[PDB]
């Protein structure tokens, strides 16, 4: 038997490391974990964002219906975030629509609604909250915090932010934190468009423009198993959009998609949106 207690203590740590790797512990909310002060964190959270929040309002926004039930159950053996949630979601819809309209006046009202819904989507809201540690600050009876409950708080925080800092700061906050999520997102990715050829024709007739005549601009490897077809939409014998496709149908569909982006001013070379403006 080897002598010494350090060696025995060292092996115990060695055993613990192996056990932890084999069986990682279940997740627990930071609130239960040590070194958590809700009041201190909220003050730091507001200062960290460099934004002014009303402590009472912000706490109410964090407060959720599920959290109250757990406390009420313990109490048996308080203001929800619904009111703030409605204000933030409603205000965000107006603010998001306003931002979209300015950049893309050509884009149809239907498209703006899809974009607004995508930006207010549960996944988008949840991702921002988790990366900001809002989930730890979120008050709920279950961990990991349910996504619908987490989404409610985020807009509730926006509603609290509106009261504390006004629409102007909240609008900058939305632009700084939410409009940034549109980077790298293609138009059809955020807005679902089916039957692009029909939609393209529908826009053209509204503008009193002749439907383009599809033509095969380029062709390669037609008889091989890997054929490449370029189809160009010619309006009044003038090419408006061209797309590549493995088949003539695919190229025509891709060309239609390119035209739709051009119609609504979503060109790949379009002017970038600006987050620098302090105004």
């Amino acid at each position: 038997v080897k002598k010494g207690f350090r060696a025995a203590f060292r092996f115990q740590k060695e055993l613990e490391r192996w056990r932890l790797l084999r069986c990682p512990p279940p997740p627990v909310r930071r609130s239960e974990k040590p070194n958590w002060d809700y009041h201190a964190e909220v003050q730091a959270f507001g200062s960290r964002l460099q934004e002014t929040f009303s402590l009472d309002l912000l706490k109410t926004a964090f407060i959720n219906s599920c959290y109250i039930k757990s406390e009420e159950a313990k109490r048996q053996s308080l203001k929800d975030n619904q009111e703030l949630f409605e204000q933030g979601l409603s205000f965000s819809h107006r603010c998001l629509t306003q931002f979209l309209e300015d950049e893309f006046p050509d884009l149809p009202a239907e498209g703006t609604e899809s974009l607004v819904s995508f930006l207010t989507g549960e996944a988008v809201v949840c991702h921002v909250a988790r990366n900001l540690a809002v989930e730890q600050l979120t008050l709920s009876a279950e961990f990991p915090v349910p996504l619908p409950v987490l989404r409610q708080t985020f807009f509730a925080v926006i509603g609290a932010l509106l009261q504390s800092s006004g629409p102007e700061r909240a609008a900058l906050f939305i632009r700084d934190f939410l409009i940034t999520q549109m980077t790298g997102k293609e138009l059809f990715e955020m807005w679902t468009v089916v039957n692009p050829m029909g939609l393209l024709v529908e826009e053209l007739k509204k503008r009193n423009i002749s439907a383009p005549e599809s033509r095969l601009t380029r062709q390669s490897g037609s008889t091989t198993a890997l054929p490449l077809y370029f189809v160009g939409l010619y309006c009044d014998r003038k090419l408006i959009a061209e797309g590549p496709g493995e088949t003539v149908l695919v190229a025509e569909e891709e060309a239609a998609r390119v035209a739709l982006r051009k119609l609504y001013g979503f060109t790949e070379n379009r002017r970038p949106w600006d987050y620098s403006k302090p105004k």
Partner: protein
Amino acid sequence: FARRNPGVVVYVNPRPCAMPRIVAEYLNGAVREENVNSKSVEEIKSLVQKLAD
């Protein structure tokens, strides 16, 4: 440092301890642990500034 950076929650817990240690937690969930055993004030200040940045 606390006045300069009030957005970071600082916990100071003098207790019977073999080796002093500093734990830094980030918003994304990253946590970094640094032992302060037998280190001078100047060394500690430089380390904390790096953690903040």
